[PDB]
Swiss-Prot record:
It comes from the Eukaryota. The record marks 84 as: Major binding site for inhibitory zinc. The lineage of its organism: Eukaryota, Metazoa, Chordata, Craniata, Vertebrata. Residues 1-224 form the Peptidase S1 domain. This is Kallikrein-5. The chain holds residues 67 to 293 of 293 of the full protein. Belongs to the peptidase S1 family. Kallikrein subfamily. Expressed in skin, breast, brain and testis. Expressed at the stratum granulosum of palmar skin.
Length: 227
């Protein structure tokens, strides 16, 4: 997250980290059900461990942390790697979470956030771009939803309704390492960190996010079919 701030501790209880062996941050993810995560479908590598209720990037012990294994990883059937469309995937945890102040699911609303809506994006991705610099703790940044017309103008012939643009201010954006992390608007999960431009936070190059309001039926039906 470029030019965000340290999240307040215990404020993003739906934030997850997908780790590679032994505890290498791979992608962000979001707890959407007591036994399921959403992440970007481009976060394809086999996950070693899911880490929840944890603030720091390092493996330092935190009383609120909960570790899991992914047992199912279901990308949206419309995703076709390396294309950006339908950039979402459901991950089933090996067991249901233990509900705490640090570990709590967030719901996806079918209401699509409108242009100008203020949303919060979070992640442990680089805080600088092009220079790679990881933070010590979870970073939070407010970004505003752009109209689909302004999104199309920024990325001509690269945008469809499965995506939304957000983040109108130069110097502020999500970036590499933030992939699959949450975009929360008015208390509900409406986006996943998907893609954008390089270096991150360029003027007139907003971040591109998976438009989750378009997938509530798929999310609900897939969780139900795999229960
Ligand atoms: N500027 C942003 N808001 C932004 C946010 C997240 C990401 N995530 C990385 C990422 N998304 C998708 C892929 C991918 C897809 C298919 C095949 C292999 C890889 N990789 C990238 C972002 O901007 C582009 C970017 C690229 C490289 C270095 N820095 C920024
Ligand atoms: C993102 O925006 C929200 C909403 O404007 C900010 O939260 C507000 O913060 C102040 C207190 O510091 C108060 O106006 C409210 O109590 C907060 N509102 C809500 C909805 O929580 C938040 O600080 C911003 N975060 C960042 C990282 O900029
Ligand atoms: C970082 O963001 C804040 C607003 O959140 C802004 O006031 C500040 O100028 C930005 N910093 C840079 C270096 O762009
Ligand atoms: Na900062």
């Amino acid at each position: 997250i470029i030019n965000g701030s340290d999240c307040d501790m215990h404020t993003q209880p739906w934030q997850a980290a997908l780790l590679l062996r032994p505890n290498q941050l791979y992608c962000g993810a979001v707890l959407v059900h007591p036994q399921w995560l959403l992440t970007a479908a481009h976060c394809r590598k086999k996950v070693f461990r899911v880490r929840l209720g944890h603030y720091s990037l390092s493996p330092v012990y935190e009383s609120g942390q909960q570790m899991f294994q992914g047992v199912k990883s279901i990308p949206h059937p419309g995703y076709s790697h390396p294309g950006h469309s339908n950039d979402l995937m459901l991950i089933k945890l090996n067991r249901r979470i233990r509900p705490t102040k640090d570990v709590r699911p967030i719901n996806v609303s079918s209401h699509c956030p409108s242009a100008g809506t203020k949303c919060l994006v979070s992640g442990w991705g680089t805080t600088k771009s092009p220079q790679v610099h990881f933070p010590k703790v979870l970073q939070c940044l407010n970004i505003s939803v752009l109209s689909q017309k302004r999104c199309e103008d920024a990325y001509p012939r690269q945008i469809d309704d499965t995506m939304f643009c957000a983040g109108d201010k130069a110097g502020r954006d999500s970036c590499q390492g933030d992939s699959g992390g949450p975009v929360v608007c008015n208390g509900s999960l409406q986006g996943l960190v998907s893609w954008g431009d390089y270096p991150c936070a360029r003027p007139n190059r907003p971040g591109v996010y998976t438009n989750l309001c378009k997938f509530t039926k798929w999310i609900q039906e897939t969780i139900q079919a795999n229960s």
